[model samples]
Target chain A: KSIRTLPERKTIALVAHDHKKDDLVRWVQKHAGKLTKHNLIATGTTGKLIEEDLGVEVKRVMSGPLGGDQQLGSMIAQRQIDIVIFFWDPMEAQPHDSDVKAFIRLCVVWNTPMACDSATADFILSSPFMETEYQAEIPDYDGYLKRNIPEA
Target chain B: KSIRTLPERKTIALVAHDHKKDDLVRWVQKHAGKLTKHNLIATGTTGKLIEEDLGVEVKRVMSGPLGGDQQLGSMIAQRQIDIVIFFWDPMEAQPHDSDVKAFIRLCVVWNTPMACDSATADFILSSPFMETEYQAEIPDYDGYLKRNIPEA
Candidate 1:
């Protein structure tokens, strides 16, 4: 593993299920001022609401059920996404449950900072470290692949 | 939350990522005899290996990245699956990371018995409760929806 440095203006990915979308939007609305200083991205279903309602610029990805979560997971593993705010509805049954799990697992495995609820999201955004350079101990994939994948 | 009971003959879902497939196979091989007593289900890639190599009849679902994990998650939510042995590779990044996470989350959300590694799998399978009825306190979605959704 090697240490990686993230810039002060970090990229944050936002996601929420249908039931939790309003909550996420409201939360974002409350913190739009601080969020304006950072890079923002969101999925298809959520981006519209966040952008339209909050007036925040957000790079959009595919829908979560289709492949958005995987896209975010890929970005997370690649170290492009610095933070995540995902408000998944725990009570509701989702069509793309595995994708959600995969995204969360990657975030954990990659050691990316994330918030799965409004309270945690609030803590992350309001923390003093939010506007500063953050360092992470990340896996060295090149060395790992070299050792694992032989003459394929 | 309300308690639910698992039948004596439980439905077990087995899944593994690319890098952890071999480890899962070996672990399954060691417990093939015990697993024979239960209903086995697996995703596309790992299912083939399990059936052909271990002589265990396994119900097949779509590949993990494609939709198999979601299929299993739906089953878990529907109370079809009882136990899970999901050995996902933590070292390697996956294309369908979200699918994997979603499945794991459903298992947890539904309070299904699950083992994520070889040691845990062994311990779970060898447990005295493995062959008997297992109980879990699961979320009461109907009541929760009535309480949270309608009010929201």
Candidate 2:
């Protein structure tokens, strides 16, 4: 008496903005065991770097500042990419911030999972549900959280 | 003796990147009633637009590109910002892509509920629990999914 859901062996996209690409590569190397288990997708720089450094294949395409960011954004819109880890640098301004913004916008549209930096990415990458076969029931917080008082 | 938990209202930071600002304003008008009931916050230009359009006052701050985005990111990192609804344009670029990205990353690091676009915003605003009384116990998806799938 129920409908079937998606399989757990889902694909995840990993693409960092220009400045954060190196950090992403380092993170992938640190978590290579977990990174390689699932399907990985990225843009020109991050994709090529991860693939080359880890010897693991990455679905590579355009760069974020270029059209790569928008492409991934569309993928997210279509629900093609399940999760995104886009590590970005905040200090220096990049030309493609708008497109990256678009990518984040779509990530919001789908309510799909996304992590913006190494810290958040690390937490998600290490989740028990990321690898292998696993599923979770999202709890209703209204009732559960009702007893607490609101801030003034 | 029993433990007590109260219903806590979330501090939601509402923002819209330039191009997506109009979309966000419409969405805010639709949900203004509900959102006002909770503590609402917004970035610089986004705050002004929402205030003018919806006639609802918002805790306004600096612009995202200037440093407003970073401030929000800091709040999110500290767990002060609960849910964020950021309406952003994907086609246009930004001066502070990193700050925007950081804010989102903080959400991930904290595991908070966030809606990135109109679609997700629709989902959150339209969900049965967001505004009404709905109750049902769901089984464990992990246990159920595991039993259904065949081992490789």
Candidate 3:
């Protein structure tokens, strides 16, 4: 099994849909002291809002519908991101719904810690693993990569 | 708002996790007559299993962990797929979890009909919309595409 090591100071990506944006912001504010020490990244508008609310600089990517979700997915696959805190609005139908689901899936695929709700976020944030280095097991894809592809 | 027209005979993608594979097969068996009238596609193992059970051909892509999910996601974004029936295993963790989520999100983003469970599938299939041409609303992303990107 391949293993990816996560450092104590991780790079966390924050994202939320329109309806859940405020909740995410409040959650971030509540964890500002613990969060400030690490690197923070967010989608366009969400990043702007978090910066304004927390008074801290956050690396910004394009909006989700505009390719932010894809950008973040690439980052997760490339190991540039360590964790994800996303507040997806389940009650609403979003135009960029696919990107949202795709982003969350990448987190799970990479074995990266991710929280989609306040409860999970609180637990993830408070975990001792967050304060120390942790090794994550990467699923072996060797057999898959070598599988035969039939001629079209 | 952009509108996409789905033909009476749609292109449907079928996907299921390991634990839910049998369930998906059963679902497909029950709908064989209706399903066979449409173009069908699926990921590696699942596609092979479906063909074996139904004695009908299913276009196959790479396995999910190896890139099938992304391939299907691309198809959705490109309008090559009209519907998606993904029975994702919610009770268990998957190595290609991100791809699964991303694939589903693409369906929503493209305004294609999608079902994540048997009940949803039944409703979608039973709808009169399935037998006739339907127009779906595509979310406008022109503004997002034209938005400014900050300098690095």
Candidate 4:
């Protein structure tokens, strides 16, 4: 329901693994004032936690391993998702590693802003530049380029 | 001294070369919740500004070119200093580049957590892993082994 609405401030999509959900909510609570104006998009359990505990509205997407990362990636390619804050457990093997990488690739390829962990996430939130216009033109990587894959 | 005492939290030394003192205080303010809980050690002018602005009590050492960098290195070698958040302007050359290198070497030799720039400083401040443990181990420096450092 909330996903359809435009945010008063910058939209920062949040996603957390099963292990870091509590920490994400705690981080949300700690920085709740700054977060409330932004539109929050998160996967299942994380979405439910913020809604229940913090009473802040969030647009719930699918679980990360269950096609949610791809869903977010699709938005990234279209420039619909402005920011991504994913707090991943670097030490653990994720079930949707490819999908996660795809999302990261979309951010990189499209030049969309992204945050991989809490450290990077907080930096994005606190940075003065995040609120400013950050769009850059993307070059086409099409059928011709793939066909012309020259030997290195 | 508080640095020598068995305090509940770690003691961190903060410093900024000339132009970066503003950057340092803003950087520290961004992580004040965590830093204020620890003991603060700093170089002369920079330390006074941090104390004046943020009201965080600071322990001062000599100015940067006047043996402060070496003093910090000694603490790092002795395991007295926990972490360092030093902001160096690469554009401007320092009088004692060797002292800076020695300070960095001590961090590596002792495996002390260090933040050289804003990016690294943000990582140390925002990360949950930083608060857990400080790894003290000898590093393997072979080309094949050392090239895969985490993009920090």
Model 2: lDDT of residue B46 = 89
Sorted into a CAPRI-style docking class, model 4 comes out as: incorrect
- Candidate 1: where are CA atoms >4 Å away? A1-152, B148-152
Model 2: clashing residue pairs? A98-B93, A98-B94, A102-B90, A108-B116, A146-B7, A147-B6, A147-B7, A148-B6, A148-B7
Q: Which ten residues in a row have the lowest lDDT in candidate 1 chain A?
A: A143-152
Q: State the lDDT of candidate 4 residue by residue for A41-106, as single tens digits.
A: 887767898899989889988876777777777776666777776654433336653244445545
Error of 4 at B95 (Å): 42
For DockQ, candidate 3 versus 4, the one ahead is: 3
* TM-score against truth, every candidate: 0.52, 0.49, 0.55, 0.46
User: Which candidate model has the greater TM-score, 3 or 4?
Assistant: 3
DockQ of each: 0.05, 0.06, 0.06, 0.04
Off by over 4 Å in 3: A1-152, B96-98
Q: How many Å off is the CA of B32 in candidate 1?
A: 0.7
lDDT by residue (tens digit), candidate 4, B1-152:
01122234777889887756787898788788888878789887789999999988899988767788778778876778877777654444466532444455456444455655554455355554445543333223355345666877
Off by over 4 Å in 2: A1-6, A96-98, A132-152, B1-152
True contacts kept of 1: 0.05
Query: What's the lDDT for residue B129 in model 2?
Result: 37
What TM value does model 2 have?
Answer: 0.49
Give the CAPRI rating of model 1.
incorrect
Better of 1 and 2 by lDDT: 1
Chain A agreement with the truth for model 1, given as TM-score: 0.88
